From a paper:
We designed an SIVcpzPtt-based disulfide (SOS), I559P (IP) prefusion stabilized Env ectodomain truncated as residue 664 (SOSIP.664) trimer, MT145K, that displays native trimer-like properties, and selectively binds V2-apex bnAbs as well as their germline reverted precursor versions. The trimer architecture exhibits a mushroom-like shape with subunits gp120 and gp41 constituting the envelope-distal and proximal entities, respectively. A chimpanzee simian immunodeficiency virus (SIV) envelope (Env) shares a single bnAb site, the variable loop 2 (V2)-apex, with HIV, suggesting its possible utility in an HIV immunization strategy.
To date, our structure represents the only atomic-level structure of an SIV Env trimer. Inaccessibility of the V3 loop is mediated by intra-protomer interactions of V1V2 to V3 and by extensive inter-protomer V1V2 trimer interactions at the apex of the spike. Therefore, to gain or improve binding of the V2-apex bnAb inferred precursor Abs to the MT145 Env trimer, we substituted a glutamine (Q) with a lysine (K) residue (HXB2 position 171) in strand C of the V2-apex bnAb core epitope. In fact, the MT145K N334 glycan is positioned in a direction away from the V3-N332 epitope site, making it impossible to facilitate bnAb binding to this epitope. MT145K lacks the N276 glycan and the proximal N234 glycan, present in most HIV Envs, but instead has a glycan at position 236.
Numbering used by the authors:
A (entry chain A), B (entry chain D), C (entry chain C): 32 to 61, 66 to 136, 143 to 148, 153 to 185, 187 to 278, 282 to 305, 308 to 321, 321A, ...
D (entry chain F), E (entry chain E), F (entry chain B): 515 to 537, 569 to 618, 618A, 619 to 664
The structure:
Amino acid sequence: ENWWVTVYYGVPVWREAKTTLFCASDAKSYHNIWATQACVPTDPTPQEVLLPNVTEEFNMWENYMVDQMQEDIISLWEQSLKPCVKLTPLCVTLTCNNPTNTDDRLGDMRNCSFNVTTELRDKKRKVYSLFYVEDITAIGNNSTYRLINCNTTAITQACPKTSFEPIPIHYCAPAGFALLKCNDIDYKGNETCKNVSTVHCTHGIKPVATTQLILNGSTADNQTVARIDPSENLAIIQLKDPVKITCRRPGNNTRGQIQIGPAMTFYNIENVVGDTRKAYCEINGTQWAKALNETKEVLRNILRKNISFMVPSGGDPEVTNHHFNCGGEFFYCNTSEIINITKINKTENMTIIPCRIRQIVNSWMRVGKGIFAPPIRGNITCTSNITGMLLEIHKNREDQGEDQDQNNTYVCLTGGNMKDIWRSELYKYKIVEIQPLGVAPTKCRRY
Amino acid sequence: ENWWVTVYYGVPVWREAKTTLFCASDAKSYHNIWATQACVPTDPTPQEVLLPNVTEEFNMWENYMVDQMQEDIISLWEQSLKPCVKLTPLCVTLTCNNPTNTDDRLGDMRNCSFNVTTELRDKKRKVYSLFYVEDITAIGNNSTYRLINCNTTAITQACPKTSFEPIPIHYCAPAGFALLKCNDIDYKGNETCKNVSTVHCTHGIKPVATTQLILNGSTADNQTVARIDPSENLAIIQLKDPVKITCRRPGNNTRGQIQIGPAMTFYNIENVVGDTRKAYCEINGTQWAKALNETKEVLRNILRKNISFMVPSGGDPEVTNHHFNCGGEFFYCNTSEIINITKINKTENMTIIPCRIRQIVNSWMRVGKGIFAPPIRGNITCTSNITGMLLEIHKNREDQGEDQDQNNTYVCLTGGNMKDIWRSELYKYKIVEIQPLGVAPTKCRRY
Amino acid sequence: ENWWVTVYYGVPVWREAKTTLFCASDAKSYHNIWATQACVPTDPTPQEVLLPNVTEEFNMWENYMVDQMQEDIISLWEQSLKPCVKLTPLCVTLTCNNPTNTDDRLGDMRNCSFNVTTELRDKKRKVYSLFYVEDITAIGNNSTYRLINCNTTAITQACPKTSFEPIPIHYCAPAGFALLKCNDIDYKGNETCKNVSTVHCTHGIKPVATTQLILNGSTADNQTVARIDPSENLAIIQLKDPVKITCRRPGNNTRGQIQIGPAMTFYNIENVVGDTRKAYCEINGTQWAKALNETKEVLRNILRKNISFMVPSGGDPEVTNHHFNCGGEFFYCNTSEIINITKINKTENMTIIPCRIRQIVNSWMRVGKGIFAPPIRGNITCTSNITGMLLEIHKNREDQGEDQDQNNTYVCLTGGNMKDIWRSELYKYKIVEIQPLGVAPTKCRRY
Amino acid sequence: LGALFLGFLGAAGSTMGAASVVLSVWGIKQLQARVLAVERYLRDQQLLGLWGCTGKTICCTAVRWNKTWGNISDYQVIWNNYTWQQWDREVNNYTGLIYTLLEEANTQQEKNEKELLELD
Amino acid sequence: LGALFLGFLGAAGSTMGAASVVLSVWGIKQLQARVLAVERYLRDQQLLGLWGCTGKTICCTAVRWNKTWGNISDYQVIWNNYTWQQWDREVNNYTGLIYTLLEEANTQQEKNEKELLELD
Amino acid sequence: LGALFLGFLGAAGSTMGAASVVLSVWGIKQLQARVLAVERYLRDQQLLGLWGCTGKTICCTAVRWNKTWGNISDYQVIWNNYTWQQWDREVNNYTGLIYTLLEEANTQQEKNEKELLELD
Ligand SMILES: *[C@@H]1O[C@H](CO)[C@@H](O[C@@H]2O[C@H](CO)[C@@H](O[C@@H]3O[C@H](CO[C@H]4O[C@H](CO)[C@@H](O)[C@H](O)[C@@H]4O)[C@@H](O)[C@H](O[C@H]4O[C@H](CO[C@H]5O[C@H](CO)[C@@H](O)[C@H](O)[C@@H]5O)[C@@H](O)[C@H](O[C@H]5O[C@H](CO)[C@@H](O)[C@H](O)[C@@H]5O)[C@@H]4O)[C@@H]3O)[C@H](O)[C@H]2NC(C)=O)[C@H](O)[C@H]1NC(C)=O
Ligand SMILES: *[C@@H]1O[C@H](CO)[C@@H](O[C@@H]2O[C@H](CO)[C@@H](O[C@@H]3O[C@H](CO[C@H]4O[C@H](CO)[C@@H](O)[C@H](O)[C@@H]4O)[C@@H](O)[C@H](O[C@H]4O[C@H](CO[C@H]5O[C@H](CO)[C@@H](O)[C@H](O)[C@@H]5O)[C@@H](O)[C@H](O[C@H]5O[C@H](CO)[C@@H](O)[C@H](O)[C@@H]5O)[C@@H]4O)[C@@H]3O)[C@H](O)[C@H]2NC(C)=O)[C@H](O)[C@H]1NC(C)=O
Ligand SMILES: *[C@@H]1O[C@H](CO)[C@@H](O[C@@H]2O[C@H](CO)[C@@H](O[C@@H]3O[C@H](CO[C@H]4O[C@H](CO)[C@@H](O)[C@H](O)[C@@H]4O)[C@@H](O)[C@H](O[C@H]4O[C@H](CO[C@H]5O[C@H](CO)[C@@H](O)[C@H](O)[C@@H]5O)[C@@H](O)[C@H](O[C@H]5O[C@H](CO)[C@@H](O)[C@H](O)[C@@H]5O)[C@@H]4O)[C@@H]3O)[C@H](O)[C@H]2NC(C)=O)[C@H](O)[C@H]1NC(C)=O
Ligand SMILES: *[C@@H]1O[C@H](CO)[C@@H](O)[C@H](O)[C@H]1NC(C)=O
Ligand SMILES: *[C@@H]1O[C@H](CO)[C@@H](O)[C@H](O)[C@H]1NC(C)=O
Ligand SMILES: *[C@@H]1O[C@H](CO)[C@@H](O)[C@H](O)[C@H]1NC(C)=O
Ligand SMILES: *[C@@H]1O[C@H](CO)[C@@H](O)[C@H](O)[C@H]1NC(C)=O
Ligand SMILES: *[C@@H]1O[C@H](CO)[C@@H](O)[C@H](O)[C@H]1NC(C)=O
Ligand SMILES: *[C@@H]1O[C@H](CO)[C@@H](O)[C@H](O)[C@H]1NC(C)=O
Ligand SMILES: *[C@@H]1O[C@H](CO)[C@@H](O)[C@H](O)[C@H]1NC(C)=O
């Protein structure tokens, strides 16, 4: 007989789809820009289920979750700077000079006096300030200085009570969608996983905005891996060994207040008190030697060519420098010395990377929403881990003239996208939609 | 026996109700103010169902869809001018004169130099501009000119990447509501239709904001019709024959840039290059003769009186002039000559309507949100169809003194409302609500 | 046998929960800040159901509805001042003097001329105004006056078409929640009620923002009651007898207009015309004698100590004064004389409280959103009822040195919170959640 | 998009006895209209649920039809000469009465006789 | 406006055995509260759906009542001397156990014996 | 939080024949995703409602299985050697046909024979 139609309902059928995810945060709420607020509290039980005999393909380089989370971070960053004060009337001609008098922060600072409008809208008065030299450009043949980004974009300072600390954020799917997770010890990037398990929520992701180096990230568990774009521009290296990095800015900063307008309270770097030593970062050279010597072979076995490095060319501190976010400060660090480890590993003491402080940031080179950093009073350090790098693929044997066999010329080591970090944490997860209807033939027949 | 109660569920019962409609756009998205964005893509199958033996009354002059779509267009127009720059600091005393030296655009333009604040907030500099004379009024006994609308309302210029092109928009009802459509070859306005069919979505409506004449509209299919308000103020004429109209502004316009503030980039009409001929429109006189001679009889059979026309009185270019939107420009056209077709149809060559350019528009005489038109670089023409007119009912035999039998004195031909155009495209559609419950007596009885 | 499981569904089970309530307004809509708009119209049938044999405890001092309605009033007050004009450019040096020449309003007003920027952004002109002395502070040794709150917060004036009239607002629970209401003739504040009834909607609450005295409120029905916090700071007195109070400001005020900017139309108190008598309030002394003599015993029986009163100390008109909202004006009234009724009740004529007018209010001492009061043209009075007071608990026998047995030193009689009024109207209502599932053992067994 | 509704009202002009059954800005518009349609559907499921008819399209009951319930004549004329728009005028004034009598006669009259007259 | 709920809780103070069944700012408040009420209703329909009771108000089942499930005495005393607020205290600690045993004993114990013991 | 869904897909890798049944920013995300999940569930209830299967998990019907409906062999091989992901590929191209034939064969073929062949 024709085995008649049955309709089940507990039916596990997948369809690949795109939808909106949502928060899961740990219960640590006490404004810390990501705010731990209007954000779903986590479930105490991490609920996953294994899926044997499952052969599932999912692509890293087309993952919708990455663009979802980039748009989330951009909209959150925009919302967090909304109630703070604008810094429009500070654009004014600046009468500057040297403040007063190797490794001196005062040499990289200028003392600038200027007229500001008070709360009376008529009586301008002369106040003074200190600024770092990389936020000031010139006009004339004497002092006559411009505060930078008065022709490009508007600048708003941050509210001082906020913190830039990256909290962990889990992503979860709404009910009616599932999150497939691979569990292989390595993943090439775009193939079929074997040990696949579903899970209701991802692991914690700290939105650490940076470049040249991935910080506080997830480490691989057998060997350092090289997730490569299809020879497009770049390749994400994920180390096994976390490499410790410390960064320091010593001394205090006396902070004043200037009333620009009604409740428009500019914060001023009034004086540098404690120590004049520049901001610097410090890593262990042997660990970095092992990490680079591992990364060379991991790229070498796949690209079949012997690996070189090249110092980045002149230009944007998007690509020439490192870009931390330590406390309420923004470090631009000169890493053109640290990729030379044959010389560097001789010194058994430690190595030093010099860094510079920036107050004015056109945010993250993709948002560009001009944020004026509030001055942080205090002796400040921060330490973190080095887990990943964003290397750029070398230029082929058509652009460099000399041989590019055995001479893989990594002319830069950068990625300007904040998105590419977020590709290095969501290489495991796929959003699927359940189709619970089902149609089958069967023995029965309804009367 | 008492035939017991049954409850059906597939029950077609109508109730007239009011609710919120939504978009259906064609898949042409490539910002073109209506934006084709956050707007539902259309269904490829136009789904309608005929409804025989249906006698349904629906009123044109109380249609909720018209006010719905007016509020949609006003809120969309307000949203589209939000991210663009304000033009507040341009209000300043203007030192103007003739630029340099019949049918000359430079005679209707003034060369105005003025002091503007730069990006430094102290160093004002002298820049210059060109403006049309109908956007400038006087102060003193020499040059001393005011930019218009510095005492009435705030002015924001439009972003230059936007386009004012009317895209087609379908309206559809949500699930749980139906759209009744009449299909009679004529419709008086407020009676019972016979050939009625339901449809999920309306036909495409281009929101063409204009007056004196309805452009790119729907044409009647047997004869020109006269949908009249209850002798209230006006009457909508819908022609059968679409009448071609072309409009031209020849020559280029050299465009400059002026930095008002941080990313406050004013666009300036720097120079007129190509040709000095004024902007003009051109129609075929014979087609217009046939259209007016048809419209006179269509009004004559209904209002029982012989038809006259009168030139509009002095006053607002809301009512005295035509109001296009050709490209990124706003044409005010003098139509007081074209309603005289007995003289006009002698010239077999063509006829010419002169038009003037306006940069500053208090938007659409009902929104009033002051938009500064961006300068359009380029030789520019646009052609369109004439499908409908918005005539005003003549004044009775109490106001004009002379006889108003045989002398229907159309003292104006206007409608200042953008709403009345939208009444001329939604005379077919009614929103109804389905009541699917149903209660009937029947033979059965449940055990 | 084990009586098998049944599952009912019409199951009345309570759980205490927190959720969002919503509007019910009377159909009086004709903008009157609370606006009677986007607000649900009331049901004509007040639907309640009695609940016998119900012993329910609910706490007044932890009621979520109070914080809900405070956040509603604050967000509504913020929304209502959004489309009105800012008053930023009015902050300017003021050249003031006496206008021209006991109980004279002109003695408490100053004539202030100042330069304001016109619509031309260059030509400042000299205009003049009148202001009350409590909105102006000094700079120098002659005239040289500051408009107040140019260093604290931004000031926006109200739109003149709005009204500050307290409309009644009912609160209702959404479907799936119920509102428990006590009906005892007295309620201590935190115990178990007996006559409990559910209701879909609360009674009408007029959001009358005030202090020192509760106006247009609900009265107790057997005796005046004293709802006390756990000796924390204060105690709410609810009278039985409503005490009539009238307040008057006689005479007209000639009002002018000043164009600050584009559609920035400041309203000016140009001249005082009719009568020079100060604004004053008037109450019957015998009724107030009875009310105080009742309140002393109601506090005396509970706190076991003989009752005193003390004049409030020097400081903020938050606490030193009364704070009405009569029409479009803000009265600050000096009530330090009226709590002495042994002297006061001798005069059988009436008693007079002097009051002062304020134009600039940092709103309600908890919002603080600086509102400039628009000038009200006209002879103006308003009458109301006195139903409740917000007394502060006396300081113990550790702070005052002298005995505090028989000497309950009410050093203030205040509450600065607008929340505490709203605790005096929602002492009856609890939000509960229905759990309609139910599980029971029963005789049956399903085949 | 509701994708859930039945009764596309096509044969409404035909005789009632022989029909016998059929078969940003716009983002806020969607998020309002979907919720409106969902709640309006669930109200119909609640009136259908309390009548012992969840899942059926056509039901019978035990409630007799009063001859005051509308203008009563030969009922075969009512089937043969009316449509739903014509009969729905005569349905009104009798909405809440029948909609309470059905909920009484199903969930109370049948369930009590199911649980008490039959012990199991 | 929900217009969908049952059980207006009036006879709650009476004895459980004899009740036997009953029968802008505010725009964002509406658009939140309607969705909350709809989802809270559908959760009750899901717990009622997996027990083979969609559309009924009163059900029986095959699951025996354990004498550890709450403080167990003569059950007629439980019907005669309690209300729902009193019995609901004793209902707790036994929520998920019974709510899993019912879903096991209906959709698995009845359906397998329907499809396998009866071949058709 | 949906708290309403069934089928947590755990035994999907096992054989289909032996599975046999299982058992601000984020505020706008919630208010969108809840409505999406509710409407997506109600669409499944509508396809299940018109088949005479509201409340059941497993149904039979009267519709015969065509041997053109997918690649047809011994059906016991289909139960023993496939999973739902494998069978769902062969389900497609036959979606709307079967989903119209079921709605015809339940609400019209059974209800007419219930009301007309049986007079009561
Ligand atoms: C990779 O991961 C690592 C590991 O997490 C990251 O390192 C962390 O970096 C954080 C900074 O971004 C560090 O937080 C600061 O820690 C300081 C020292 O904390 C000591 O005490 C705490 C106990 O409280 C203890 O756990 C810790 O181990 C240390 O012993 C703090 O002083 C500092 O306070 C900052 O915040 C306050 C106010 O903020 C408070 O409230 C917030 C909510 O609004 C809340 O989120 C905060 O946690 C905090 O409770 C702020 O006022 C301070 O500024 C001045 O304050 C007063 C004047 O007001 C003045 O006296 C003082 O000197 C300050 O000048 C201050 O900015 C932070 O909490 C964290 O400790 C680091 N973790 C480790 C293990 O070292 C690393 O950053 C990551 N990598 C990258 C690239 O991000
Ligand atoms: C009644 O209905 C009629 C029929 O539709 C309406 O007439 C139409 O009016 C439109 C203007 O409102 C016309 O559009 C312009 O057409 C120009 C010529 O197009 C030629 O080429 C196209 C193929 O691309 C072909 O189909 C056509 O027939 C012509 O042969 C275009 O040059 C002009 O471009 C404008 O837009 C660009 C950028 O905009 C682009 O992107 C938008 C999305 O953001 C998209 O919506 C646009 O379509 C477009 O793709 C803009 O940069 C141009 O401005 C300058 O650009 C460069 C410098 O950047 C400079 O070199 C150049 O010279 C310009 O100065 C430009 O403004 C428009 O697409 C349309 O063609 C007319 N249709 C017909 C049949 O004639 C009539 O308007 C209606 N009545 C009323 C009252 O509205
Ligand atoms: C405790 O409860 C009591 C009892 O309600 C409260 O007393 C009420 O206080 C209100 C003020 O807040 C009083 O309202 C004003 O009443 C005036 C006199 O009304 C007479 O006529 C009405 C019939 O219309 C009659 O019922 C009444 O008994 C009186 O005989 C009105 O003149 C005054 O008008 C105000 O509003 C207009 C415009 O507002 C209109 O439109 C609003 C919607 O936008 C609507 O809400 C309003 O009701 C009103 O219809 C405004 O233009 C006026 O201002 C000037 O207007 C022209 C120039 O434009 C000028 O000629 C005129 O002289 C004004 O200078 C004006 O501000 C109010 O309606 C109410 O009458 C009081 N009730 C009683 C019984 O006395 C008490 O306030 C409460 N306690 C507290 C602390 O609040
Ligand atoms: C910096 O300031 C803190 C307190 O503000 C003080 O304890 C510390 O000694 C200071 N450090 C130096 C180097 O002056
Ligand atoms: C690198 O590898 C290539 C083989 O691809 C080899 O020819 C070359 O000599 C190697 N160079 C070094 C330095 O090992
Ligand atoms: C206008 O400019 C375009 C290019 O910008 C050029 O091709 C054209 O010839 C110009 N027309 C005139 C009349 O100069
Ligand atoms: C117009 O019609 C009227 C009849 O209503 C007639 O008396 C009059 O003479 C006509 N005039 C012309 C010019 O045809
Ligand atoms: C106040 O003005 C009103 C009209 O504006 C007038 O009727 C009234 O007499 C005036 N009162 C005095 C005291 O001048
Ligand atoms: C007030 O009451 C106390 C008892 O607590 C008593 O000792 C005292 O004398 C009383 N004083 C007066 C003035 O009645
Ligand atoms: C006008 O003022 C007089 C006394 O100045 C007062 O008696 C009368 O009540 C007032 N009228 C109004 C409407 O305020």
